[PDB]
Protein backbone atom coordinates (compact mmCIF):
# COMPACT_ATOMS: atom_id res chain seq x y z
CA UNK A 1 0.00 0.00 0.00
CA UNK A 2 1.07 3.90 -0.40
CA UNK A 3 2.87 5.20 2.56
CA UNK A 4 0.45 8.72 2.04
CA UNK A 5 -1.96 9.02 -0.17
CA UNK A 6 -2.95 13.08 -0.37
CA UNK A 7 -6.11 15.56 -1.09
CA UNK A 8 -4.24 17.93 -2.57
CA UNK A 9 -4.99 20.95 0.22
CA UNK A 10 -2.30 22.39 1.37
CA UNK A 11 0.06 21.38 4.68
CA UNK A 12 -1.26 24.68 6.68
CA UNK A 13 1.28 26.27 9.21
CA UNK A 14 -0.28 27.39 12.86
CA UNK A 15 20.70 30.51 8.74
CA UNK A 16 17.27 29.64 7.59
CA UNK A 17 14.13 27.93 9.24
CA UNK A 18 12.45 25.14 7.58
CA UNK A 19 8.88 26.55 6.41
CA UNK A 20 5.31 24.91 5.49
CA UNK A 21 6.14 26.62 1.75
CA UNK A 22 8.61 23.62 1.50
CA UNK A 23 6.15 20.92 2.73
CA UNK A 24 5.44 19.38 -0.97
CA UNK A 25 8.98 18.87 -1.55
CA UNK A 26 9.28 16.14 1.46
CA UNK A 27 5.55 15.09 0.30
CA UNK A 28 6.87 13.71 -2.87
CA UNK A 29 9.80 12.00 -1.00
CA UNK A 30 7.41 10.04 1.58
CA UNK A 31 5.01 8.82 -0.92
CA UNK A 32 5.27 5.16 -2.47
CA UNK A 33 4.31 2.04 -2.46
CA UNK A 34 6.33 -0.54 0.04
CA UNK A 35 7.77 -3.96 -0.92
CA UNK A 36 8.66 -6.61 1.74
CA UNK A 37 9.46 -10.10 1.81
CA UNK A 38 9.69 -11.71 4.77
CA UNK A 39 12.35 -15.09 5.62
CA UNK A 40 13.20 -17.49 8.04
CA UNK A 41 16.12 -14.82 10.03
CA UNK A 42 13.11 -12.49 10.33
CA UNK A 43 10.56 -14.88 11.85
CA UNK A 44 13.40 -16.34 14.24
CA UNK A 45 14.75 -12.99 15.88
CA UNK A 46 10.90 -12.25 16.11
CA UNK A 47 10.26 -15.09 18.36
CA UNK A 48 13.22 -14.83 20.62
CA UNK A 49 12.55 -10.51 20.78
CA UNK A 50 8.59 -12.13 21.85
CA UNK A 51 10.23 -14.33 24.29
CA UNK A 52 12.13 -11.49 25.98
CA UNK A 53 9.30 -9.59 26.54
CA UNK A 54 7.37 -12.04 27.62
CA UNK A 55 9.05 -11.85 30.78
CA UNK A 56 7.93 -7.87 30.83
CA UNK A 57 4.61 -6.89 33.54
CA UNK A 58 2.96 -3.04 32.62
CA UNK A 59 1.24 -1.84 34.66
CA UNK A 60 -1.98 1.43 33.55
CA UNK A 61 -1.22 4.53 34.23
CA UNK A 62 -4.13 6.20 35.71
CA UNK A 63 -5.54 9.69 34.45
CA UNK A 64 -3.34 11.55 37.37
CA UNK A 65 -0.04 10.28 36.20
CA UNK A 66 -0.73 10.69 32.59
CA UNK A 67 -2.37 14.23 32.84
CA UNK A 68 1.19 14.79 34.99
CA UNK A 69 3.26 14.08 31.82
CA UNK A 70 1.63 16.37 29.58
CA UNK A 71 4.26 18.81 28.81
CA UNK A 72 2.92 22.54 29.15
CA UNK A 73 3.49 23.78 25.51
CA UNK A 74 1.66 20.35 24.59
CA UNK A 75 -0.71 20.98 21.52
CA UNK A 76 -4.43 21.64 22.59
CA UNK A 77 -7.35 19.75 22.02
CA UNK A 78 -9.99 20.46 19.63
CA UNK A 79 -12.78 19.72 22.07
CA UNK A 80 -11.89 23.20 24.07
CA UNK A 81 -8.73 22.60 26.82
CA UNK A 82 -5.37 22.55 26.50
CA UNK A 83 -2.19 21.23 27.87
CA UNK A 84 -2.53 23.69 31.48
CA UNK A 85 -6.11 22.35 32.17
CA UNK A 86 -4.67 18.72 31.86
CA UNK A 87 -1.79 19.54 34.14
CA UNK A 88 -4.68 21.06 36.51
CA UNK A 89 -6.49 18.53 36.28
CA UNK A 90 -9.30 20.84 35.60
CA UNK A 91 -13.20 18.82 34.98
CA UNK A 92 -13.38 19.49 31.48
CA UNK A 93 -10.22 17.97 30.58
CA UNK A 94 -10.70 15.05 32.53
CA UNK A 95 -13.81 14.40 31.38
CA UNK A 96 -13.06 14.42 28.00
CA UNK A 97 -9.75 12.04 28.81
CA UNK A 98 -12.32 9.69 30.21
CA UNK A 99 -15.14 9.68 27.38
CA UNK A 100 -11.85 9.15 24.94
CA UNK A 101 -10.21 6.03 27.23
CA UNK A 102 -13.73 4.33 27.32
CA UNK A 103 -14.30 5.18 23.46
CA UNK A 104 -10.67 3.18 22.93
CA UNK A 105 -12.54 0.34 25.06
CA UNK A 106 -15.60 0.03 22.53
CA UNK A 107 -14.49 0.69 19.49
CA UNK A 108 -12.43 -1.64 18.01
CA UNK A 109 -12.20 -0.07 14.36
CA UNK A 110 -12.63 3.82 13.62
CA UNK A 111 -10.01 4.84 12.65
CA UNK A 112 -8.77 7.95 14.71
CA UNK A 113 -7.74 11.54 12.89
CA UNK A 114 -4.93 13.06 13.23
CA UNK A 115 -3.06 16.11 12.21
CA UNK A 116 -0.32 16.76 9.93
CA UNK A 117 1.99 20.10 10.17
CA UNK A 118 5.20 20.84 8.39
CA UNK A 119 7.88 21.54 11.30
CA UNK A 120 9.84 24.71 11.46
CA UNK A 121 13.77 23.65 12.22
CA UNK A 122 16.95 26.15 11.68
CA UNK A 123 19.68 24.92 9.45
CA UNK A 124 22.71 26.46 7.98
CA UNK A 125 20.98 24.21 -0.80
CA UNK A 126 17.99 24.05 1.54
CA UNK A 127 16.35 21.18 3.04
CA UNK A 128 12.32 20.72 2.87
CA UNK A 129 10.45 20.87 6.51
CA UNK A 130 10.12 17.20 7.84
CA UNK A 131 6.04 16.62 8.31
CA UNK A 132 4.74 15.88 11.75
CA UNK A 133 1.75 13.84 12.13
CA UNK A 134 -0.47 13.19 15.61
CA UNK A 135 -3.77 12.50 17.52
CA UNK A 136 -5.60 15.13 19.65
CA UNK A 137 -4.31 15.72 23.17
CA UNK A 138 -7.03 13.50 24.47
CA UNK A 139 -5.61 10.59 22.56
CA UNK A 140 -2.57 11.61 23.33
CA UNK A 141 -3.48 11.44 27.54
CA UNK A 142 -5.03 7.94 26.40
CA UNK A 143 -1.85 6.90 24.44
CA UNK A 144 0.03 7.28 28.12
CA UNK A 145 -2.21 5.42 30.13
CA UNK A 146 -1.92 2.22 28.36
CA UNK A 147 1.35 2.54 27.26
CA UNK A 148 3.72 4.40 29.00
CA UNK A 149 4.69 2.41 31.44
CA UNK A 150 5.56 -0.56 28.35
CA UNK A 151 7.68 2.11 26.11
CA UNK A 152 9.65 2.65 29.32
CA UNK A 153 10.25 -1.21 30.47
CA UNK A 154 9.94 -3.42 27.12
CA UNK A 155 12.94 -2.09 25.04
CA UNK A 156 15.33 -2.60 27.45
CA UNK A 157 14.30 -5.91 28.17
CA UNK A 158 13.78 -6.89 24.59
CA UNK A 159 16.74 -5.26 23.14
CA UNK A 160 19.37 -5.53 26.61
CA UNK A 161 22.30 -3.56 26.27
CA UNK A 162 21.42 -2.69 22.13
CA UNK A 163 18.65 -0.35 23.40
CA UNK A 164 20.53 3.33 22.94
CA UNK A 165 17.48 5.51 24.96
CA UNK A 166 19.06 3.71 28.64
CA UNK A 167 22.09 5.76 28.33
CA UNK A 168 23.85 8.50 29.75
CA UNK A 169 26.02 9.94 27.63
CA UNK A 170 28.86 8.97 29.63
CA UNK A 171 27.45 5.38 29.46
CA UNK A 172 26.97 5.68 25.92
CA UNK A 173 30.62 6.30 25.15
CA UNK A 174 31.86 3.82 27.83
CA UNK A 175 29.35 0.72 25.85
CA UNK A 176 31.31 1.84 22.48
CA UNK A 177 34.70 1.92 24.09
CA UNK A 178 33.95 -1.65 25.46
CA UNK A 179 32.71 -3.10 22.34
CA UNK A 180 34.95 -1.89 19.90
CA UNK A 181 37.60 -3.27 22.68
CA UNK A 182 36.50 -6.46 22.75
CA UNK A 183 37.16 -7.38 19.21
CA UNK A 184 40.03 -8.63 18.08
CA UNK A 185 40.08 -6.72 14.79
CA UNK A 186 36.87 -4.37 14.68
CA UNK A 187 34.60 -3.32 11.88
CA UNK A 188 32.08 -0.37 12.41
CA UNK A 189 28.86 1.35 10.21
CA UNK A 190 26.45 3.07 10.65
CA UNK A 191 23.32 2.20 8.62
CA UNK A 192 20.41 4.92 7.17
CA UNK A 193 17.43 4.37 5.97
CA UNK A 194 15.66 6.29 3.26
CA UNK A 195 12.39 7.76 5.09
CA UNK A 196 12.28 4.99 7.69
CA UNK A 197 8.90 6.84 9.05
CA UNK A 198 7.07 5.45 5.55
CA UNK A 199 9.05 2.54 5.31
CA UNK A 200 7.09 0.90 8.12
CA UNK A 201 4.55 -1.49 7.14
CA UNK A 202 1.41 -2.15 8.46
CA UNK A 203 2.35 -5.44 9.35
CA UNK A 204 5.57 -4.39 11.13
CA UNK A 205 3.24 -2.19 13.09
CA UNK A 206 1.14 -5.53 13.80
CA UNK A 207 4.31 -7.35 14.65
CA UNK A 208 5.23 -4.29 16.95
CA UNK A 209 2.05 -5.16 18.78
CA UNK A 210 2.31 -9.11 18.77
CA UNK A 211 5.46 -7.74 20.99
CA UNK A 212 3.29 -5.38 23.38
CA UNK A 213 0.77 -8.23 23.68
CA UNK A 214 3.62 -10.39 25.46
CA UNK A 215 3.60 -8.44 28.87
CA UNK A 216 1.61 -9.25 31.50
CA UNK A 217 -1.46 -6.36 30.68
CA UNK A 218 -4.74 -5.28 32.63
CA UNK A 219 -7.45 -5.98 30.67
CA UNK A 220 -8.46 -2.17 29.67
CA UNK A 221 -4.52 -1.94 28.63
CA UNK A 222 -4.52 -4.95 26.34
CA UNK A 223 -8.02 -3.80 24.41
CA UNK A 224 -6.41 -0.16 24.28
CA UNK A 225 -3.12 -1.50 23.14
CA UNK A 226 -5.82 -3.68 20.05
CA UNK A 227 -7.70 -0.46 19.25
CA UNK A 228 -5.35 2.05 19.10
CA UNK A 229 -2.96 -0.03 16.80
CA UNK A 230 -5.89 -0.30 14.45
CA UNK A 231 -7.35 2.89 14.57
CA UNK A 232 -4.48 5.04 15.18
CA UNK A 233 -1.02 3.06 14.78
CA UNK A 234 -1.35 1.81 11.21
CA UNK A 235 -2.95 4.68 9.86
CA UNK A 236 -5.90 6.93 9.21
CA UNK A 237 -6.96 10.54 7.64
CA UNK A 238 -4.76 13.09 7.62
CA UNK A 239 -6.59 17.07 8.43
CA UNK A 240 -4.56 20.32 8.33
CA UNK A 241 -4.08 23.07 10.59
CA UNK A 242 -7.19 24.37 9.14
CA UNK A 243 -9.46 21.15 9.36
CA UNK A 244 -9.34 20.32 5.86
CA UNK A 245 -9.03 16.68 4.75
CA UNK A 246 -4.93 16.70 3.61
CA UNK A 247 -5.35 12.80 2.88
CA UNK A 248 -4.60 9.57 4.08
CA UNK A 249 -1.29 7.64 6.34
CA UNK A 250 -0.13 3.82 6.31
CA UNK A 251 2.82 4.27 7.91
CA UNK A 252 4.38 5.29 11.14
CA UNK A 253 2.86 8.34 12.62
CA UNK A 254 5.47 10.69 13.99
CA UNK A 255 3.90 12.23 17.02
CA UNK A 256 2.44 9.10 18.51
CA UNK A 257 3.29 8.01 22.09
CA UNK A 258 5.32 4.68 20.06
CA UNK A 259 7.07 6.14 17.42
CA UNK A 260 10.28 5.90 18.90
CA UNK A 261 10.13 2.77 20.81
CA UNK A 262 8.07 1.18 17.82
CA UNK A 263 10.98 2.25 15.07
CA UNK A 264 14.14 1.36 17.74
CA UNK A 265 12.08 -2.60 18.34
CA UNK A 266 11.18 -2.47 14.18
CA UNK A 267 14.99 -1.52 13.09
CA UNK A 268 16.30 -3.23 15.92
CA UNK A 269 14.51 -6.88 14.49
CA UNK A 270 15.26 -5.73 10.65
CA UNK A 271 18.90 -5.36 11.39
CA UNK A 272 19.42 -8.58 13.87
CA UNK A 273 17.74 -10.32 11.18
CA UNK A 274 19.65 -8.84 8.07
CA UNK A 275 22.93 -9.14 10.48
CA UNK A 276 22.20 -13.16 9.98
CA UNK A 277 21.41 -13.05 6.12
CA UNK A 278 25.11 -11.14 5.40
CA UNK A 279 26.88 -13.24 8.11
CA UNK A 280 28.29 -10.83 9.86
CA UNK A 281 30.65 -12.31 12.70
CA UNK A 282 30.17 -11.53 16.38
CA UNK A 283 27.86 -8.00 16.12
CA UNK A 284 27.47 -6.14 18.94
CA UNK A 285 24.26 -3.64 17.66
CA UNK A 286 23.25 -0.21 18.98
CA UNK A 287 19.89 1.30 17.74
CA UNK A 288 18.07 4.70 18.59
CA UNK A 289 15.19 4.87 16.44
CA UNK A 290 15.89 4.41 13.16
CA UNK A 291 19.53 5.30 13.55
CA UNK A 292 21.45 1.97 14.04
CA UNK A 293 25.56 1.47 14.75
CA UNK A 294 26.69 -2.46 14.15
CA UNK A 295 30.25 -3.14 15.37
CA UNK A 296 31.76 -6.48 14.16
CA UNK A 297 35.03 -8.98 13.67
CA UNK A 298 36.43 -7.64 10.05
CA UNK A 299 36.97 -10.51 7.89
CA UNK A 300 39.03 -8.32 5.39
CA UNK A 301 38.49 -5.05 3.46
CA UNK A 302 36.88 -6.83 0.09
CA UNK A 303 34.87 -9.66 2.66
CA UNK A 304 33.48 -6.01 4.94
CA UNK A 305 32.56 -4.63 1.75
CA UNK A 306 30.74 -7.62 0.79
CA UNK A 307 28.99 -8.76 3.81
CA UNK A 308 28.02 -5.00 3.85
CA UNK A 309 26.27 -5.13 0.46
CA UNK A 310 24.58 -8.44 1.38
CA UNK A 311 23.73 -6.59 4.99
CA UNK A 312 21.65 -3.94 2.40
CA UNK A 313 20.05 -6.31 0.14
CA UNK A 314 18.08 -8.20 3.53
CA UNK A 315 17.59 -4.65 5.10
CA UNK A 316 15.83 -3.53 1.76
CA UNK A 317 13.63 -7.37 1.51
CA UNK A 318 12.42 -6.11 5.00
CA UNK A 319 11.45 -2.44 3.32
CA UNK A 320 13.76 -0.65 5.01
CA UNK A 321 16.05 1.03 1.89
CA UNK A 322 19.16 2.98 2.53
CA UNK A 323 19.54 6.47 2.30
CA UNK A 324 23.46 6.54 1.64
CA UNK A 325 25.12 3.21 1.25
CA UNK A 326 26.81 2.18 4.76
CA UNK A 327 30.92 2.05 4.49
CA UNK A 328 32.96 0.40 6.97
CA UNK A 329 35.21 1.80 9.17
CA UNK A 330 38.28 0.57 11.11
CA UNK A 331 38.44 3.86 13.93
CA UNK A 332 35.37 4.00 16.25
CA UNK A 333 36.20 7.62 15.99
CA UNK A 334 35.61 7.34 12.11
CA UNK A 335 31.59 6.26 13.03
CA UNK A 336 28.97 9.09 12.53
CA UNK A 337 25.46 8.32 14.22
CA UNK A 338 22.86 10.73 15.46
CA UNK A 339 25.18 13.49 13.93
CA UNK A 340 27.71 12.96 16.59
CA UNK A 341 31.13 11.10 16.89
CA UNK A 342 33.42 9.67 19.97
CA UNK A 343 36.56 11.68 20.09
CA UNK A 344 38.99 11.73 23.18
CA UNK A 345 40.57 14.19 25.66
CA UNK A 346 42.61 14.43 28.76
CA UNK A 347 41.42 14.78 32.46
CA UNK A 348 43.01 17.21 34.77
CA UNK A 349 45.52 13.93 35.82
CA UNK A 350 46.46 13.48 32.45
CA UNK A 351 44.09 10.09 31.96
CA UNK A 352 42.18 9.32 28.73
CA UNK A 353 38.72 10.40 28.40
CA UNK A 354 36.36 9.46 25.63
CA UNK A 355 33.45 11.61 24.23
CA UNK A 356 30.56 12.04 21.85
CA UNK A 357 30.57 15.69 19.74
CA UNK A 358 29.34 16.27 16.92
CA UNK A 359 30.45 19.68 14.18
CA UNK A 360 28.77 22.81 15.62
CA UNK A 361 27.69 24.37 12.57
CA UNK A 362 24.19 23.52 13.33
CA UNK A 363 23.87 23.54 17.39
CA UNK A 364 25.61 27.16 16.77
CA UNK A 365 23.15 28.21 14.14
CA UNK A 366 19.91 27.23 16.27
CA UNK A 367 21.20 29.35 19.47
CA UNK A 368 21.97 32.24 16.92
CA UNK A 369 18.69 31.98 16.06
CA UNK A 370 17.24 31.29 19.53
CA UNK A 371 19.61 34.44 20.97
CA UNK A 372 17.38 36.32 18.05
CA UNK A 373 14.12 35.57 18.85
CA UNK A 374 12.37 34.29 21.99
CA UNK A 375 11.68 30.36 21.45
CA UNK A 376 9.51 28.05 24.57
CA UNK A 377 11.87 25.02 23.77
CA UNK A 378 15.89 25.65 23.26
CA UNK A 379 18.09 23.58 22.14
CA UNK A 380 21.17 25.45 23.57
CA UNK A 381 20.96 24.50 26.51
CA UNK A 382 19.88 20.65 25.58
CA UNK A 383 23.41 21.04 23.37
CA UNK A 384 25.36 22.32 26.98
CA UNK A 385 23.99 18.98 28.74
CA UNK A 386 24.15 16.61 25.63
CA UNK A 387 27.48 18.23 24.62
CA UNK A 388 29.01 19.55 28.18
CA UNK A 389 32.75 17.51 27.75
CA UNK A 390 32.79 19.22 24.23
CA UNK A 391 35.62 22.12 23.31
CA UNK A 392 32.66 24.28 21.76
CA UNK A 393 29.85 23.96 24.05
CA UNK A 394 32.18 25.06 27.12
CA UNK A 395 33.79 27.79 25.60
CA UNK A 396 31.14 29.44 23.47
CA UNK A 397 27.34 28.02 25.07
CA UNK A 398 28.31 28.31 28.40
CA UNK A 399 29.83 31.14 28.17
CA UNK A 400 27.80 33.23 25.70
CA UNK A 401 24.15 32.36 27.57
CA UNK A 402 25.41 32.62 30.96
CA UNK A 403 26.67 36.02 30.32
CA UNK A 404 23.02 36.75 28.72
CA UNK A 405 21.24 35.00 32.26
CA UNK A 406 23.49 37.44 34.36
CA UNK A 407 22.61 40.39 32.29
CA UNK A 408 18.89 39.26 32.28
CA UNK A 409 19.01 38.05 36.31
CA UNK A 410 17.39 35.13 34.67
CA UNK A 411 19.97 32.06 36.62
CA UNK A 412 17.01 30.71 37.98
CA UNK A 413 14.43 30.95 35.68
CA UNK A 414 13.60 27.12 34.34
CA UNK A 415 13.29 26.53 30.80
CA UNK A 416 12.41 24.22 28.10
CA UNK A 417 14.21 22.64 25.74
CA UNK A 418 14.46 19.33 23.76
CA UNK A 419 17.44 17.35 23.27
CA UNK A 420 16.91 14.64 20.15
CA UNK A 421 13.72 13.35 21.47
CA UNK A 422 12.22 14.92 24.61
CA UNK A 423 11.33 17.55 26.44
CA UNK A 424 13.15 18.75 30.09
CA UNK A 425 12.49 21.65 31.87
CA UNK A 426 15.70 22.89 33.55
CA UNK A 427 17.20 25.48 35.87
CA UNK A 428 20.24 26.71 34.06
CA UNK A 429 21.83 27.10 37.96
CA UNK A 430 21.38 23.11 38.06
CA UNK A 431 24.06 22.49 35.01
CA UNK A 432 26.86 21.84 37.29
CA UNK A 433 25.42 18.72 39.00
CA UNK A 434 23.37 17.41 35.83
CA UNK A 435 26.99 17.25 33.46
CA UNK A 436 28.59 15.51 36.84
CA UNK A 437 25.76 12.99 36.73
CA UNK A 438 25.72 12.42 32.72
CA UNK A 439 29.40 13.03 31.82
CA UNK A 440 31.74 12.39 35.59
CA UNK A 441 33.73 15.17 37.43
CA UNK A 442 36.35 15.19 34.63
CA UNK A 443 33.54 17.34 31.54
CA UNK A 444 35.04 19.85 33.86
CA UNK A 445 38.93 19.50 33.73
CA UNK A 446 39.29 18.25 29.65
CA UNK A 447 41.61 19.66 28.15
CA UNK A 448 44.09 17.93 24.90
CA UNK A 449 41.66 18.16 22.96
CA UNK A 450 42.30 16.66 19.17
CA UNK A 451 44.17 18.76 16.01
CA UNK A 452 40.86 17.40 13.95
CA UNK A 453 38.35 18.99 17.09
CA UNK A 454 40.03 22.16 17.13
CA UNK A 455 40.22 22.40 13.51
CA UNK A 456 36.49 21.73 13.31
CA UNK A 457 35.88 24.21 15.84
CA UNK A 458 38.11 27.15 14.54
CA UNK A 459 36.80 26.77 11.03
CA UNK A 460 32.95 26.54 11.74
CA UNK A 461 33.48 30.01 13.99
CA UNK A 462 35.36 31.70 10.80
CA UNK A 463 32.99 30.52 8.57
CA UNK A 464 29.53 31.59 11.05
CA UNK A 465 31.46 35.20 11.66
CA UNK A 466 31.90 34.02 15.36
CA UNK A 467 34.61 35.66 17.84
CA UNK A 468 37.64 33.83 17.87
CA UNK A 469 38.20 31.14 21.11
CA UNK A 470 40.76 33.84 22.54
CA UNK A 471 37.60 36.18 22.60
CA UNK A 472 35.61 33.48 24.56
CA UNK A 473 38.56 33.13 27.16
CA UNK A 474 38.63 36.73 28.27
CA UNK A 475 34.40 36.80 28.15
CA UNK A 476 34.07 33.75 30.69
CA UNK A 477 36.95 35.14 32.87
CA UNK A 478 34.16 37.81 33.62
CA UNK A 479 31.29 35.86 33.39
CA UNK A 480 33.10 33.74 36.04
CA UNK A 481 34.34 36.00 38.34
CA UNK A 482 30.38 37.48 38.17
CA UNK A 483 28.82 33.90 39.19
CA UNK A 484 31.45 33.19 41.57
CA UNK A 485 30.85 36.82 43.40
CA UNK A 486 26.68 35.69 44.17
CA UNK A 487 27.33 32.01 45.91
CA UNK A 488 25.61 29.24 46.08
CA UNK A 489 24.69 27.15 42.60
CA UNK A 490 25.87 29.99 40.64
CA UNK A 491 29.29 30.39 42.58
CA UNK A 492 29.33 26.42 41.49
CA UNK A 493 28.53 27.23 37.80
CA UNK A 494 31.20 29.66 37.85
CA UNK A 495 34.05 27.96 39.67
CA UNK A 496 33.12 23.96 37.27
CA UNK A 497 31.24 25.17 34.56
CA UNK A 498 34.92 28.18 33.77
CA UNK A 499 37.48 26.17 35.24
CA UNK A 500 38.74 26.11 32.08
CA UNK A 501 39.05 29.39 31.87
CA UNK A 502 41.58 30.79 34.69
CA UNK A 503 45.53 30.18 34.03
CA UNK A 504 45.93 28.24 37.48
CA UNK A 505 42.68 25.69 37.60
CA UNK A 506 41.38 24.70 40.64
CA UNK A 507 41.25 21.16 42.03
CA UNK A 508 37.75 20.40 41.61
CA UNK A 509 35.60 18.41 44.28
CA UNK A 510 32.16 16.36 43.85
CA UNK A 511 29.20 18.49 44.15
CA UNK A 512 27.17 17.11 47.06
CA UNK A 513 23.97 17.91 46.33
CA UNK A 514 24.70 15.83 42.70
CA UNK A 515 24.37 13.02 44.46
CA UNK A 516 20.28 13.72 45.18
CA UNK A 517 19.02 14.22 41.56
CA UNK A 518 16.54 11.47 40.73
CA UNK A 519 17.66 11.49 37.08
CA UNK A 520 15.71 7.61 36.39
CA UNK A 521 12.72 9.33 34.17
CA UNK A 522 15.68 11.29 31.86
CA UNK A 523 17.27 8.29 30.32
CA UNK A 524 15.16 5.45 30.80
CA UNK A 525 13.15 5.39 27.00
CA UNK A 526 13.20 7.43 24.06
CA UNK A 527 9.97 9.74 23.59
CA UNK A 528 11.04 11.30 20.43
CA UNK A 529 6.85 12.61 19.02
CA UNK A 530 6.39 10.84 22.39
CA UNK A 531 5.00 14.54 23.70
CA UNK A 532 6.53 13.39 27.55
CA UNK A 533 7.54 16.19 30.26
CA UNK A 534 10.65 15.85 32.07
CA UNK A 535 10.63 18.17 35.05
CA UNK A 536 13.74 17.93 37.15
CA UNK A 537 13.35 16.94 40.79
CA UNK A 538 15.88 15.96 44.21
CA UNK A 539 15.01 13.24 46.83
CA UNK A 540 16.08 14.72 50.75
CA UNK A 541 17.46 18.13 50.20
CA UNK A 542 20.15 18.62 52.30
CA UNK A 543 20.01 22.12 54.85
CA UNK A 544 23.61 23.33 53.94
CA UNK A 545 22.99 22.88 50.30
O1 LIG B 1 40.47 38.95 16.74
C1 LIG B 1 40.16 39.48 17.80
O2 LIG B 1 41.03 39.74 18.74
C2 LIG B 1 38.74 39.83 18.09
C3 LIG B 1 37.77 39.59 17.22
C4 LIG B 1 36.33 39.79 17.43
C5 LIG B 1 35.45 39.49 16.40
C6 LIG B 1 34.09 39.68 16.54
C7 LIG B 1 33.57 40.14 17.75
N1 LIG B 1 32.16 40.25 17.85
C8 LIG B 1 31.46 41.05 18.68
O3 LIG B 1 31.97 41.74 19.54
C9 LIG B 1 29.94 41.11 18.43
N2 LIG B 1 29.36 39.77 18.21
C10 LIG B 1 29.60 38.74 19.06
O4 LIG B 1 30.23 38.89 20.11
C11 LIG B 1 29.04 37.41 18.67
C12 LIG B 1 28.75 36.49 19.68
C13 LIG B 1 28.17 35.27 19.40
C14 LIG B 1 27.83 34.94 18.09
C15 LIG B 1 27.09 33.87 17.48
C16 LIG B 1 26.40 32.75 18.20
C17 LIG B 1 27.40 31.78 18.86
C18 LIG B 1 26.68 30.65 19.59
C19 LIG B 1 25.71 31.20 20.62
C20 LIG B 1 24.69 32.09 19.95
C21 LIG B 1 25.37 33.25 19.23
C22 LIG B 1 27.04 34.13 16.12
N3 LIG B 1 27.71 35.31 15.86
C23 LIG B 1 28.17 35.84 17.07
C24 LIG B 1 28.78 37.07 17.33
C25 LIG B 1 27.91 35.89 14.53
C26 LIG B 1 26.51 36.40 14.15
O5 LIG B 1 26.27 37.60 14.05
N4 LIG B 1 25.54 35.48 13.95
C27 LIG B 1 25.65 34.07 14.02
C28 LIG B 1 24.99 33.34 13.04
C29 LIG B 1 25.08 31.95 13.02
C30 LIG B 1 25.81 31.29 13.98
C31 LIG B 1 26.48 32.00 14.97
C32 LIG B 1 26.40 33.40 15.01
C33 LIG B 1 29.18 41.84 19.55
C34 LIG B 1 29.30 43.34 19.20
C35 LIG B 1 29.88 43.41 17.74
C36 LIG B 1 29.68 42.01 17.20
C37 LIG B 1 34.44 40.43 18.80
C38 LIG B 1 35.80 40.26 18.63
C1 LIG C 1 23.15 4.46 17.39
N1 LIG C 1 23.64 5.79 17.72
C2 LIG C 1 23.84 6.18 18.98
O1 LIG C 1 23.49 5.53 19.96
C3 LIG C 1 24.53 7.48 19.15
C4 LIG C 1 25.79 7.85 18.76
C5 LIG C 1 26.91 7.15 18.14
C6 LIG C 1 26.95 5.75 18.15
C7 LIG C 1 28.03 5.07 17.61
C8 LIG C 1 29.06 5.80 17.09
F1 LIG C 1 30.18 5.14 16.70
C9 LIG C 1 29.06 7.17 17.02
C10 LIG C 1 27.97 7.85 17.55
O2 LIG C 1 26.06 9.16 19.13
C11 LIG C 1 24.93 9.62 19.78
C12 LIG C 1 24.76 10.86 20.37
C13 LIG C 1 23.59 11.09 21.07
C14 LIG C 1 22.59 10.11 21.18
C15 LIG C 1 21.43 10.30 22.10
C16 LIG C 1 20.13 9.93 21.74
C17 LIG C 1 19.08 10.09 22.62
C18 LIG C 1 19.29 10.64 23.88
C19 LIG C 1 20.57 11.06 24.25
C20 LIG C 1 20.93 11.72 25.55
O3 LIG C 1 22.08 11.66 25.99
N2 LIG C 1 19.96 12.39 26.22
C21 LIG C 1 20.12 13.07 27.53
C22 LIG C 1 20.47 12.04 28.59
C23 LIG C 1 18.80 13.76 27.88
C24 LIG C 1 21.23 14.11 27.42
C25 LIG C 1 21.63 10.87 23.36
C26 LIG C 1 22.77 8.88 20.53
C27 LIG C 1 23.95 8.63 19.83
Not at 104 to 122: G, Q, S
Not at 207 to 213: A, K, L, N, R
Not at 433 to 446: K, P
Not at 503 to 514: F, M, S, V
Amino acid sequence: SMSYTWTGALITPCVYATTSRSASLRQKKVTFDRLQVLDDHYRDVLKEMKAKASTVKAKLLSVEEACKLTPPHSARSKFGYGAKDVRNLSSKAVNHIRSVWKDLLEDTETPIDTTIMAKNEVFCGRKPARLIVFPDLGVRVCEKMALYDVVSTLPQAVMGSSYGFQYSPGQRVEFLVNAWKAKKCPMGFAYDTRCFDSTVTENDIRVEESIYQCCDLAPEARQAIRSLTERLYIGGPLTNSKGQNCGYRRCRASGVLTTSCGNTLTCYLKAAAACRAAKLQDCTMLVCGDDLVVICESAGTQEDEASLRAFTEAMTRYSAPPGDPPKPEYDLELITSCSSNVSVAHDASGKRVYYLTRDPTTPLARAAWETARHTPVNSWLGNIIMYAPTLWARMILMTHFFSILLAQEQLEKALDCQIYGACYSIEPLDLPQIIQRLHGLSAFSLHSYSPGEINRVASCLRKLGVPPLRVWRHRARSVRARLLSQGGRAATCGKYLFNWAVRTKLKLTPIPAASQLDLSSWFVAGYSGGDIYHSLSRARPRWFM
